[PDB]
UniProtKB/Swiss-Prot annotation:
The gene is thiT. It is found in: Cell membrane. Keywords: Cell membrane, Membrane, Transmembrane, Transmembrane helix, Transport. Belongs to the vitamin uptake transporter (VUT/ECF) (TC 2.A.88) family. Thiamine transporter subfamily. The chain crosses the membrane at residues 11-31, 51-71, 73-93, 107-127, 145-165. GO terms for molecular function: thiamine transmembrane transporter activity. This is Thiamine transporter ThiT. It comes from Lactococcus lactis subsp. cremoris (strain MG1363). It is a multi-pass membrane protein. Probably a thiamine-binding protein that interacts with the energy-coupling factor (ECF) ABC-transporter complex. Unlike classic ABC transporters this ECF transporter provides the energy necessary to transport a number of different substrates. The substrates themselves are bound by transmembrane, not extracytoplasmic soluble proteins.
Length: 177
C-alpha cells in the first residue's frame, strides 16, 4: 500500500532528524553521523526511491529547523540535499526474500555512507578549505576529515544494522501482509 509506504518514509526521515540532535562530534567536523541509520534502514527495506525521498525530507528538515550549517546556496544544495538523498543508493541492495543475508546489508551501507561522504569531501574542498589545519592542503584536509567521518559513520551503522539483522531480520523485508 501507498499509505503504509508514505508513513514509513515520513517516520524514518523524522527519526533521522531527531537522531541528528544527539551530539556526535569527535573532533571538529570529524563526526559519527548515526542519523544516517534510519535512512539506510528505510532504503534497505523499501528500495531506491523510498530511500532517496527519505533522504530528501531529512535534509529539508535539517535546513528549515536551523540545524544545518550553510555557507552558500550551492553548498547547502550539495550537503543537505544531494548528500542525504544519496544514502538511498542503499536501496539497490534491498532483499525481498528470506532468509536475510548480512552481506547485502553491509555492502549497501558501505556504498551509501561512502557516497554520502564523497559529496561532503567534495564540499570540503570547495567550501571548507579556510579551516584546513596548519600545513594541510585543502584536498588532504577534506580527505582526512570526511574520510574519517565516513569510516566512523559506517562503523556505527554496521554495529547497529548488525544487531538488527540478528535480532530483528524482518525489519529489512517488507511484507504486504
Ligand atoms: C527546499 C527547502 C529548503 C529551504 C530551507 C532553507 C532554510 C533557510 C536558511 O537560510 C538562511 O537564510 C537566512 C536569510 O538570508 C540567512 O540569515 C542564513 O545565513 C541562511 O542560512
Ligand atoms: C538547495 C538548498 C536550498 C538552500 C536555501 C538556503 C540558502 C542560504 C543562503 O546562505 C547564504 O548564502 C549566500 C550565498 O549563497 C552567502 O553569501 C551567505 O553568507 C549565506 O549565509
Ligand atoms: C579514507 C581516507 C582516510 C585517511 C585520511 C588520509 C590523510 C590524507 C593525506 O594525504 C597526503 O598527505 C601527504 C602528507 O605528506 C601530503 O603531502 C599529500 O599531498 C597528501 O595527498
Ligand atoms: C572539511 C569539512 N568541514 C565541514 C564540512 C561540512 C560537513 C561535513 S559532514 C556534514 C554532514 O552534515 C557536513 C555539513 C565538510 N564537508 N568538510
Amino acid at each position: 500500500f501507498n499509505v503504509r509506504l508514505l508513513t514509513e518514509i515520513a517516520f524514518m526521515a523524522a527519526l533521522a532528524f531527531i537522531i541528528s540532535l544527539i551530539p556526535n562530534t569527535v573532533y571538529g567536523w570529524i563526526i559519527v553521523e548515526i542519523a544516517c541509520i534510519p535512512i539506510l534502514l528505510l532504503s534497505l527495506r523499501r528500495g531506491l526511491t523510498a530511500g532517496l525521498v527519505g533522504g530528501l525530507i531529512w535534509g529539508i528538515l535539517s535546513m528549515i529547523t536551523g540545524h544545518a550549517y550553510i555557507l552558500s546556496l550551492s553548498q547547502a544544495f550539495l550537503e543537505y540535499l544531494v548528500a542525504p538523498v544519496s544514502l538511498g543508493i542503499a536501496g539497490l541492495f534491498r532483499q525481498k526474500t528470506a532468509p536475510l543475508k548480512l552481506a547485502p546489508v553491509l555492502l549497501g551501507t558501505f556504498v551509501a555512507v561512502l557516497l554520502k561522504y564523497f559529496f561532503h569531501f567534495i564540499a570540503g574542498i570547495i567550501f571548507w578549505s579556510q579551516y584546513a589545519w596548519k600545513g594541510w592542503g585543502a584536498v588532504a584536509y577534506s580527505l582526512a576529515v570526511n574520510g574519517i567521518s565516513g569510516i566512523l559513520t559506517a562503523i556505527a551503522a554496521f554495529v547497529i544494522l548488525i544487531i538488527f539483522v540478528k535480532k530483528f531480520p524482518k525489519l529489512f523485508i517488507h511484507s504486504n501482509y
